[PDB]
Design a binder for this molecule. Structure first.
Ligand code: NA
Ligand code: NA
Ligand code: NA
Ligand SMILES: [Zn+2]
Ligand SMILES: [Zn+2]
Ligand SMILES: [Zn+2]
Lengths: 112, 112, 110
């Protein structure tokens, strides 16, 4: 009964605390919480980044120098609660998947 | 059943995390959590600030230059769990309701 | 109700990763290792008592306190590493006197 009220308060406090996160350091984690992704969803985003980063390294080893298709695949599978640009810049700023993010930022720069 | 224990743990963790908040940037959010205010209570505080800020803007437009009574109204309706001085300084430091807070801080300097 | 709690547990896991480790490594440690409130409090109580024992022995003229670290390692929650906990407590500014004595002892024996 009141266990629900305890949980609501905790939910309110997380909403307050995420507002105190240094956005220059952990914007991606702030994004996950702010957009309400579950653990499964958050992990699914990372797996997409893992696989596309691994595909990028593989293609580079094979002599590929353009990887525009990787961004389209990313955009096509990324959780719809998230914005592509916003997620990429957040991952980038938090220091995650650097190689892949720099490639995505480069591609967006060419087409935006 | 055992859902109580997992919640108790989360409550402990929020208590630890609020202690890690940069008090020069988010003292007001820290105060809400530290004093145990519910979401409804936190929002009620913001609503008082909204209305007194709007009353202040309205009185300034009408030519008033003193607004001492706004602090008495604030102090009389502010949630009992909070200290007037502490709340005002917290709101001020976090950058919220600047106009109203500066007026409140001025009034307090004249009467404290 | 279970799913809401699970999400909060995930968010706490995310938030603890945003903690400034130069300022609150000990609190980050408690959360990261999953200690309950009672466990967290029990750690502080061990530090309280050994800090008090240290102040007491200093007053009596003792100048070596190696045994205090052994007592600490012997009672400290098994979920925590001794070195890691001491450095986290030290860096967060807690039990300064006791931690400096522990760090000194470790330097002599590590
Ligand atoms: Na799709
Ligand atoms: Na009243
Ligand atoms: Na033991
Ligand atoms: Zn893989
Ligand atoms: Zn209004
Ligand atoms: Zn004692």
């Amino acid at each position: 009964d009141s266990m629900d009220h305890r949980i609501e308060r905790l939910e309110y406090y997380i909403q307050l605390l995420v507002k105190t996160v240094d956005m220059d350091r952990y914007p991606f984690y702030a994004l996950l919480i702010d957009k309400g992704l579950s653990k499964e969803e958050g992990e699914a985003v990372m797996r997409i980044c893992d696989e596309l980063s691994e595909e990028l390294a593989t293609q580079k080893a094979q002599g590929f120098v353009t990887f525009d298709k990787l961004l389209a695949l990313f955009a096509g599978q990324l959780n719809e609660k998230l914005d592509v640009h916003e997620t990429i810049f957040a991952l980038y700023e938090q220091g995650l998947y650097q190689e892949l993010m720099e490639v995505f930022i480069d591609i967006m720069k060419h087409f935006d």
